[PDB]
């Protein structure tokens, strides 16, 4: 009867086209502002002093870029970790010079993605679902907050944060290799196993369902039209695909249970990306990966090279060349 109850009834209605919910009250204003500023800053945005040395790095399309090289540049080294909104900038020209829109996009992104995650919970509550799709979405939220939030914190500047682009991503990955040795760190190892394993069990499960489909169509029409939507009959012989994989490797390595099978597809990647995103986090605070340089010696004591020493000389090439003007002192403490 009241105005608030007629508003709570609408905002929590599943009869809307897109469910809004109470998290959409701060998902939609956040992500539309992260979007509408991203499209403008990617297309039309002046160059940005990223190294704090007043050498402005172009990143937008109107200043001679493309899809690959164009990128929303991170904020300055001069700012660093300080909060830099528009009203604390004394003009928009001073805001866009010092890496303004990187903080406006990222902070409205991480609020909107952490609200998109809670929105996946909310609709599962109002639909009668068991709730935990949003726990599986915690794994890219852990990884998005690792390269945009946690790594600028432990390194003390948003300038070490990830550039919102495509070539800026590979500037981020290579400089992160030289300074932290991520490939030898066992948490990037535990998530390469998460996505190689994840793409394995995806294409391994998706093939054994498509292999054992039941005849419901003719050879002229499509294979997919043998599934009517909302039917109650099972659309594939699960005993058939169990007997196949029960002979392809051996018998006891096969899940006859389809529920425990469809749980292992959700376990393996998500655990692999939780562990990986806490690799960037523990390497944000300079707890680097393994270092086996000069580890094998002869009885005389001369250093015998290994593959890690060849990997070290690739890291030394990126270390002596990243931010080639920003350094003045012999050790990259930042």
């Amino acid at each position: 009867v009241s105005l608030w109850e007629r508003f709570c009834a609408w905002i929590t209605s599943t009869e809307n086209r897109l469910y809004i919910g109470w998290f959409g009250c701060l998902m939609f204003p956040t992500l539309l502002t992260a979007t509408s500023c991203f499209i403008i800053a990617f297309i039309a945005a002046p160059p940005v002093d990223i190294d704090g040395i007043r050498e402005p790095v172009a990143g937008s399309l109107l200043y001679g870029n493309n899809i690959i090289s164009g990128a929303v540049v991170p904020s300055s080294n001069a700012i660093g970790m300080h909060f830099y909104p528009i009203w604390e900038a004394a003009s928009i020209d001073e805001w866009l010079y010092n890496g303004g829109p990187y903080q406006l996009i990222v902070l409205h992104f991480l609020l909107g993605v952490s609200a998109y995650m809670g929105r996946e919970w909310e609709l599962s509550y109002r639909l009668g679902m068991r709730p935990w799709i949003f726990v599986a979405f915690s794994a890219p939220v852990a990884a998005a907050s690792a390269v945009f939030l946690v790594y600028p914190i432990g390194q003390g500047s948003f300038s070490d944060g990830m550039p919102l682009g495509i070539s800026g991503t590979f500037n981020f990955m290579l400089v992160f290799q030289a300074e932290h040795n991520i490939l030898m760190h066992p948490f990037h190892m535990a998530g390469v196993a998460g996505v190689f394993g994840g793409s394995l069990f995806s294409a391994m499960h998706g093939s054994l369902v498509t292999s054992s489909l039941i005849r419901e169509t003719t050879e002229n029409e499509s294979t997919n039209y043998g599934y009517k939507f909302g039917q109650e009959e099972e659309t594939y012989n699960i005993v058939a695909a169990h007997g196949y994989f029960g002979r392809l490797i051996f018998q006891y390595a096969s899940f006859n249970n389809s529920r425990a099978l469809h749980f292992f597809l959700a376990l393996w990647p998500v655990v692999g990306i939780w562990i990986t995103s806490m690799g960037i986090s523990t390497m944000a605070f300079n707890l680097n990966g393994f270092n086996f340089n000069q580890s094998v010696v002869d009885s005389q004591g001369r250093v015998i090279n290994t593959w890690a020493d060849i990997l070290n000389r690739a890291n030394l090439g990126i270390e002596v060349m990243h931010e080639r003007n920003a350094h003045n002192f012999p050790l990259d403490l930042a």
Binding site: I39, I43, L61, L62, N65, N66, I67, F229, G230
Partner: peptide, 30 residues
């Protein structure tokens, strides 16, 4: 002149995302 093509590819991609969400073929039981 060159960046005009890149912008048209980007907003043209966001058009077909708009039509796929709102003008989707709504699936129906029976």
């Amino acid at each position: 002149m060159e960046a005009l093509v890149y912008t048209f590819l980007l907003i043209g991609t966001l058009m077909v995302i708009f039509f796929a969400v709102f003008f989707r073929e709504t699936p129906r039981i029976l």
